[PDB]
Every structure is written in structure tokens, then in C-alpha cells.
Design a protein around this nucleic acid. Structure first.
Lengths: 118, 118, 130
DNA sequence: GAAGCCACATCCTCT
DNA sequence: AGAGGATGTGGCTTC
């Protein structure tokens, strides 16, 4: 809980939280580093355990049948919105391409250090 | 199928649903029919708009006349017409000079399109 | 028939035409999904070719315009005013010979315009139909 | 309350 | 593995 990621992204309890905002929470919570983490390159991250992420996403959205195949469809819908892009060639690796710095108020260098990423 | 009069005494067009989801293929392939003689190969174009959207984004709004018939392969409406509001269609037959036929309150385009009550 | 008998009347009577006989606000409808820069060049270069897409914003009535008589110089004018263009294109709108006429700001990509009955083409047109 | 707008959730086809 | 089309679904807002 290094920072109010979801909050700093716009989630204010109003309506369901959006997938990218959810992924942001997991990325700012040291305990989730086992299944999702920053690659160390800017706002790039990888889902080391796609199924665990899917499950959590499922649990939060009240959709038990939710699996990675479906979650990734949600991510791909982000390509045109320029919110998240895929890192070609790297399995399960995506990257926030929106202005996270303004939102979060920290730079990737700053956030990686805070979350002690290696 | 069944045709219908347009705002021009020289052209007729197929019937369009009164309400339809945006970017969704139409139930009945749209087509423009010329009363008088029109040379094969003559291009025909479709445009849309109204007080809420001055120009709706369309897809495949171009067709070539053939035997008095110009049928659009998968015409789609992307721009939306507004709550309750409908689109004014402008059909343009490119002869010399160009002949243009309109069709008011032709179709209502929305995000969902028709849906069963909730 | 390519035109309606009461060609002259329809223009002065029918509401559709009346609302478009006054100096209405017009606007370039082309590539609305592209950067303003690209829309600008696209629009001007297309005028040079004698064609453009414009609609009467207020009414939302779109029109595809062909600047030519029955490259040009009288139908497309870029001299009449710096940064502006005075287009002009005839056509048979809903069975009524008319002539579109208006201008557009080469930078704002919008302007003013309207329709004007075409006594000339109207007559001769009715001639063919007899 | 209907009727809009959204962001998915589901399912699938193709490479 | 991953891209993206088609279409249904529930949360919320606006007329």
C-alpha cells in the first residue's frame, strides 16, 4: 500500500473499478509482487502468474468464471485508448503508456525504489 | 427487397431499421436504386448528420451503380444520432453534374441499439 | 424523372430548401478523425482538385460538392481573400437544380454558405423531361 | 423509468 | 501467445 494507486488514477468508488486501475493497485502493493511486477523499465510490467491476476480480477469484479484469456481481451481493448500497450515478443508483458507520472505523482524510478523492485 | 421513396424523384433506397447499434452490420444490406437511367460504374455515396452530430462517421459508404442498382456491401453507422434524435441521410449519385437525394429521420444510431427492458 | 415539375416552386416553398437559402454555417466534414494539420492540407489540396465535403452544421445536412460547371478558377477562388476560399458547385438536390455557394477558412476549415436556385440548368433540365 | 453511454465479459476465428 | 471482430451485460447518468 505504498500509494493510493486506484485513487490517484480516478477510481472514487463510483461504479466498478476499471481493469487498468485494478492492475495499478496490485502493482503498488508489495505483497502482489509474486504474480505481477514492474519489469524495471518505465511503466512496463509483467504478469508472472496470469492466472492469479485473473482470479483476483475475477474476485473483484464478481465474475468467478473470469480467466486470463478474458482479462487479456480487456487489455487489448486498451491499445486504441492509449492507456496500456503490449510489449512485443515478451510473454505477458504490458506497459502503461498513459501519463502515470502525473496521476501517481511519482516517476517510475521513484516508484520502483519505493516498492523495492529488483 | 422492399424499396422506399427518397427526397428525390429519381431515387429509391432499401429499408433501414429505425434503431440500430453503432458499428453493427445492418440487418438488410442497404442499396440505392435509380428510377431514371444511370450509367453503370457511376459512384454513389452516403453521408449522415443532424442537429446533434453534424457529420456521422460511417463505414463503407461507397458503392458503384450497376443495372440501376447500387448496393453497399456492409454499410455501417459509427457516429451516434442522439437520444430520440434520428439521422438525415444524404445519398449522392455522381453523374455530371452530381444528383443528391436526402432521407430525413432515416435511422437512429446509439451505443447499445435496441435492447429488451431491464 | 431527374427533376420535379414545380422545380422553381419547390425551392421557394419547401422548408428543406428555405432553411438553406440563407447564410447558414457550413463546415468541412472530411476526415474528422485526423489531426487538424492533416485535415487542413487534405481539404485544400482537394479543393484544388475541385471537390470537397461540407455540411450545414445547424441542420446537419451533409453534401458532397463537385466544383465544376454542367481544375477551375470561377468555381474555386483562393484570391478573393487571404486565408479563405470561395467555392461554388451546382447539382440536382432532391429534383431541384441549385448551386451551392460559400466560403471556408483555410485554417479553421469552416465558414458560411447556402443554396441558390439555378434558373439555367433548371429550365433546360425540364426541357429534356418535356 | 426508459433510454443513453461505458467498460468490459464472453466467445470465436486466424496467424 | 496474441490480435481483434461480434454481441450480450450490468453500473451509472440524463432526458
Amino acid at each position: 500500500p505504498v500509494i493510493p494507486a486506484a485513487a490517484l488514477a480516478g477510481y472514487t468508488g463510483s461504479g466498478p473499478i476499471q481493469l487498468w486501475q485494478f492492475l495499478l493497485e496490485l502493482l503498488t502493493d508489495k505483497s502482489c509482487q509474486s504474480f505481477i511486477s514492474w519489469t524495471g523499465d518505465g511503466w512496463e510490467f509483467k504478469l508472472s502468474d496470469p492466472d492469479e491476476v485473473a482470479r483476483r480480477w475475477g474476485k473483484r469484479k464478481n465474475k468467478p468464471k473470469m480467466n486470463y484469456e478474458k482479462l487479456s481481451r480487456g487489455l487489448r481493448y486498451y491499445y486504441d485508448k492509449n492507456i496500456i500497450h503490449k510489449t512485443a515478443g515478451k510473454r505477458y508483458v504490458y506497459r502503461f503508456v498513459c501519463d502515470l507520472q502525473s496521476l501517481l505523482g511519482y516517476t517510475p524510478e521513484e516508484l520502483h525504489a519505493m516498492l523495492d523492485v529488483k | 427487397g422492399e424499396l422506399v421513396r427518397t427526397d428525390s424523384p429519381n431515387f429509391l433506397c432499401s429499408v433501414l431499421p429505425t434503431h440500430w447499434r453503432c458499428n453493427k452490420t445492418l440487418p438488410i444490406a442497404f442499396k440505392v436504386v435509380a428510377k431514371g437511367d444511370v450509367p453503370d460504374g457511376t459512384l454513389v455515396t452516403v453521408m449522415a448528420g443532424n442537429d446533434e452530430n453534424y457529420s456521422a462517421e460511417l463505414r463503407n459508404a461507397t458503392a458503384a451503380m450497376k443495372n440501376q442498382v447500387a448496393r453497399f456491401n456492409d454499410l455501417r453507422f459509427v457516429g451516434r444520432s442522439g437520444r430520440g434524435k434520428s439521422f438525415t441521410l444524404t445519398i449522392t449519385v455522381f453523374t455530371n453534374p452530381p444528383q443528391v437525394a436526402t432521407y430525413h429521420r432515416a435511422i437512429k444510431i446509439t451505443a447499445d441499439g435496441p435492447r429488451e427492458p431491464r | 424523372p431527374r427533376v420535379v415539375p414545380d422545380q422553381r416552386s419547390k425551392f421557394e416553398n419547401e422548408e428543406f430548401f428555405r432553411k438553406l437559402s440563407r447564410e447558414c454555417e457550413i463546415k468541412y466534414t472530411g476526415f474528422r478523425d485526423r489531426p487538424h494539420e492533416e485535415r487542413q492540407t487534405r481539404f485544400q489540396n482537394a479543393c484544388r482538385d475541385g471537390r470537397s465535403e461540407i455540411a450545414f452544421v445547424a441542420t446537419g445536412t451533409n453534401l458532397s460538392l463537385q466544383f465544376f460547371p454542367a481544375p477551375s478558377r470561377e468555381y474555386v477562388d483562393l484570391e478573393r481573400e487571404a486565408g479563405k476560399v470561395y467555392l461554388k458547385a451546382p447539382m440536382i438536390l432532391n429534383g431541384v437544380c441549385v448551386i451551392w455557394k460559400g466560403w471556408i477558412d483555410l485554417h479553421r476549415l469552416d465558414g458560411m454558405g447556402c443554396l441558390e436556385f439555378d434558373e439555367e440548368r433548371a429550365q433546360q433540365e425540364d426541357a429534356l423531361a418535356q
